[model samples]
Target: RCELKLIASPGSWRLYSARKIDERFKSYEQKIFQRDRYTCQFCGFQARLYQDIVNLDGDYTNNRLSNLVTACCFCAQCFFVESVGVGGYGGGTLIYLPELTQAELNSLCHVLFCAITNDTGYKSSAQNIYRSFKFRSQIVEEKFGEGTSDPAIFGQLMIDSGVNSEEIREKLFKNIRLLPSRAKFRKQIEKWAASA
Candidate 1:
């Protein structure tokens, strides 16, 4: 059951394909959404605001599962409108998770599901429509906390502290855990991915 479809983004062609390679990608997204309890991958938006898969006009960018996850209707659209021509869509990071491991990635997916959906008391607050960014970040931060520093920095600094980059999920997760929400965090840790 593998295929690469030319799905439309809100207004044009964007590819949404899946093979064994892309299966990892699908797993990546569904896992993130499941992990994050179906919240959008950006701006800490929750599922209440998660848009119904927008009727696409195009999705040529090949935003695989992990690559093309959803966000709050407004924020996701906002990021797209704001950037328009920069890195494809969604969050701004442009790196493929070339070395993702299944077990590690699985843990990320599962944990996210636990935190975002099952554990948090404030998941629905994101649906409030008029919430300000500062209030939102602060709410998630107080519970998730504004990570002490950047997880990406933590990974890079590990080598400085005598940690080997080889198979270093602890080193990796430090950076992974800092994302504002579980979606970005799990995506950070997904090593193997593809479009869905």
Candidate 2:
């Protein structure tokens, strides 16, 4: 059903109808979501069974797994909104991640997931986000080891970084830890919140 759906974005419709290619595209969505830990790479909202697997370059025809990512409804809507303007949904730096190894991409994804989700003061600036990702990544590896699946560990790192207000920072860091919390896991969502 999705294969026949009209792509709403320009350059999205590449004229083609090969079953093998279509199947590959579906596979790409699944893999991208899993690689992204079922969390919205933009807002870090976790989707359990359903998720908006977004095409990074507005080219739905570009089915390369790296071109796709798991996104929350709000971010997905923002992507569509941005589509009307230049470089729509300009998290363009993420799609270039195809060149990096899987592990490297995973690490970066973890940071991206946490930074935006936490409403980090620097989330809006791509440059700042990238810098924070690098900074938090090093802390994650040092404190929790590499390849950890716990977003709470990452969330804790962000909270402890002193990025937020001094008042919230002290209260927030009162007891966060590396073990992670089940309640803190990114949960599936049907609606959007300003931020958590």
Candidate 3:
């Protein structure tokens, strides 16, 4: 009755078992995506190209359908940070600047406004805003070497980096009429800026 018990050593059995489980889950990966309707369960983001299936209980060995859910890349990153606690995922550090000047905030708002507005000309404004942010991120990475930093200093760096608030305002005013959900967007932007 116990003839098969001694077939492999314990260490070898564990490695073989893990590989077999992983291989088995590969077959059910797409099935999980289909069940979640190609949407991020955490943030409701509809993924067009790709999605991630996360284990709810954080047990990779537990591949039951009830333990799985779909997540977008962004939400999945957030989840990883929450679970693993910053830097645990390795590489770049997560930085949060807690403050920004009125001008700085307004400039960002203008950038976001132009970004989501359905106008071809305003797209360039968004691109410019994105470029500035990207540059700022690089500077931050260089200065801080990974984690968070002071907002006042960060705002100063943003200004010094040549994000002209007045220029962004002028661009926004020129295309003010192009905005559709003006009030709601402003409220949302203000709320986001305040929180940030």
Best by TM-score: 3
How well does candidate 2 score on lDDT at residue 16?
Answer: 24
Q: What tens digits encode model 3's per-residue C-alpha lDDT throughout 1-196?
A: 0000001011232332353357766667678778878766754645444456655554556667887777643334322322222223211122323254222333354446545454468767775654443344444455544432222233233334453454663442221111112242344434433443
| lDDT (Cα, 0-100) at 47 in candidate 3 | 42
| Rank list by TM-score | 3, 2, 1
**What TM-score does each of the candidates earn?**
0.24, 0.32, 0.40
User: Where does model 1 exceed 4 Å of error?
Assistant: 1-32, 52-59, 79-196
Is candidate 1 or 2 superior in lDDT? 2
After TM-score superposition, the amount by which residue 33's alpha carbon in candidate 3 deviates from its true location, in angstroms, is: 1.3
Better of 1 and 3 by lDDT: 3
Off by over 4 Å in 2: 1-24, 82-196
Clashes of each: 24, 0, 0
Report the alpha-carbon TM-score of model 3 versus the true structure.
0.40
Candidate 3 has an lDDT of: 0.41
